[PDB]
Design a protein around this nucleic acid. Sequence first.
RNA 1: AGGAGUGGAGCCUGCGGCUUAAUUUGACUCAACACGGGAAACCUCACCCGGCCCGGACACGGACAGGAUUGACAGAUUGAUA
RNA 2: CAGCCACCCGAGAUUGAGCAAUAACAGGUCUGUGAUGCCCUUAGAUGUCCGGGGCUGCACGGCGCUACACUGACUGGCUCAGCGUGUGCCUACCCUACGCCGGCAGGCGCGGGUAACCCGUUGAACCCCAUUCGUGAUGGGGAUCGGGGAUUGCAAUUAUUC
Lengths: 55, 101, 97, 120, 126, 74
Amino acid sequence: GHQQLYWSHPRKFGQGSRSCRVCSNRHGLIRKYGLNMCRQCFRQYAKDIGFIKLD
Amino acid sequence: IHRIRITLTSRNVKSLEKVCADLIRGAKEKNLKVKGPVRMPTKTLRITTRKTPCGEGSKTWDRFQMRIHKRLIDLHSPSEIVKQITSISIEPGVEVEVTIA
Amino acid sequence: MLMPKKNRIAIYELLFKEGVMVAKKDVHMPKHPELADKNVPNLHVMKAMQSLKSRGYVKEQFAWRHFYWYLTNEGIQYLRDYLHLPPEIVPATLRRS
Amino acid sequence: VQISKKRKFVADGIFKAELNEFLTRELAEDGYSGVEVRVTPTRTEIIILATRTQNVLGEKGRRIRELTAVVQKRFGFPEGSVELYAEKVATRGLCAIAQAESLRYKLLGGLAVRRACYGV
Amino acid sequence: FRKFTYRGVDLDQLLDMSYEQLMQLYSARQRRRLNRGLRRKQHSLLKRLRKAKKEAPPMEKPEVVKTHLRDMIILPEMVGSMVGVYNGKTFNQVEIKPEMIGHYLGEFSITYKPVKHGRPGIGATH
Amino acid sequence: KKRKKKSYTTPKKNKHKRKKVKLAVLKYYKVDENGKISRLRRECPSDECGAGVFMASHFDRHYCGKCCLTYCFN
RNA sequence: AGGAGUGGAGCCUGCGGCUUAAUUUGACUCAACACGGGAAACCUCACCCGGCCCGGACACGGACAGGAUUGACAGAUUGAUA
RNA sequence: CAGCCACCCGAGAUUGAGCAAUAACAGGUCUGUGAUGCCCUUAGAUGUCCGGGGCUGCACGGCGCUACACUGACUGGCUCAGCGUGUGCCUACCCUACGCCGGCAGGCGCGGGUAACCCGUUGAACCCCAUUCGUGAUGGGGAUCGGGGAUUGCAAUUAUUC
């Protein structure tokens, strides 16, 4: 069970293979440009990372 | 060999222009030829995300833009002066890549 | 799941000789490249650390999905006197000046 | 290997966010104001701006040394390739982060809300 | 009457020749799960095939066998065995003709059906 | 949504039962009038198998299971 | 004043009706409903269902020195590696 | 006067967004959170195992769709008008030109690309419109399942098949 039944097929790619790099949350992630945050964490840190509201 | 390319990049155009002027003036002060500051197109990273942290409310979005300004400058000079000019304590916020082609 | 003792002894020795452990560990997978050579499941280490905190000997900080520990004189003395590992090994938290 | 320019900018931004959050959580008892970062070839220098320097350097320069480790072991820099210093910001009342930390500290000591706000 | 011809292509003539050159002309679909190789992850299907063809020959409903596999097809000897879904809620028993080679609708077993539709009247606006 | 709803199913069914034993003695080849082992049996010349483990005979399945491979001569 | 529109003459989902749950967790609207960046065949809020688990590996009431921690598996082990 | 409506040396005579006050809501979020007050106790615990499957039991008076027609046609017409992504640092999983299997989904092979450097001069309409419109059921569907042969991912059964 620990290592005998699982790990017998490619399943390393699902949504559970990702999580927000700030809060380990798997919902609403941002993959674009690779900063890998959720919506809200990115909104919090956008000023610091370098994204500024101009449009 | 007299083919050297320096790549200047930054999010802030003020620092980019100041460092470009620094490099050009350093090249031209000593007897030496230098090309003009090739001005590459700015890259506008756009990301749009709902303002709200939940599902309630009118659908209002945030359009975060991020401008990357990059220039390329040519140099036909010995590598010693290039290395001296590169280590001139550049202004913060600017990323430089000096390549000896 | 396996519960050994000498693997934890090696983990304790590396913690003493470093101050913090550098080995990403996943509960789901038995081996990770950083986890390897120190084959103890993450769960073991963090449960032992939670028991340690309930007891209390070491300092810690947390940031962006990462732990950052600090081993003070209390932890050095405790690892010294429990496991009877002699002080011929000098801690790495007091290097230089 | 090397990555694209926009990805390097995003990566340095996320690194700065990591660093700022880390030093706000860790240096929450000294009084944390900000950080400056400067780059030269393979030498990256980080400065923590705070109101109290004799308290942030620590005994025999312990903390200031220790911080290097928790940078070096985390950010993935090559060994001995990270340097960091400590200077005191000229003023204190003009930094909103500093005064927010001061108000937070005053409310941490039980001092009443209105008098703490009046003081700040 | 009319027997089974493989969608306008002869089948007895197909079995007239040898067997090694039929994989070069193997039909479309229902071969991917064992397409990794005629190797492991296949013995279960053939075990159930022998089970069914020993308890029930072709042109017959099999005896208590509920396989959920598409039963990768080479010949209409698939009849005599049934693809069935077992949960305690799914139970299909249909005798299907042996015209199924690599093509459409050889499976009448269905794992869903419409649920009880109530009364659609009693007003539509207020 | 609603909870698992897996508590009231499977009536008149019992779990698979595994025997509770204290010692692993009869599991090995022990027919020598003393329970000792002889040198007539060969040892596998490979490194993936533990030295302590020795061949044994079971009137069912096999003395194995982690790798799920029968080790019998068959 | 018009144009394009609408459970009508296709396509994607949010109520017109619900008890092997099948969908409405935010609604006094226009500030619920292609919204939770929520396109769930990844383990989705598991959902409904013959699902091998322990995910007690917080130090101190009983605590053995085997909590009992696999199976492609021939109708007697009636699902593709429960 | 503040201003408004039209124009006689004359490129420019309301572009569109961002920010957006005091005071409020028992508005939403504790199912974003190492942002946190007030909690549960004991067996297939919400975290592994669920072949099958959750709104799909549905009839254009909730976004994105049909012009009963020279304003409209299939390159005899394009030296084109034109946002922005793209590969291995955790991590295999990126964008793809070009040949062959080819008259093609899909497969094979060396190649380029960390990017104004490669995809790429991005196939963002075909304006004379070289099958070619008289009283327009009939180019304004073709009320869609048969066919070279059907997927880098266990599961495609109301679904990336093309």
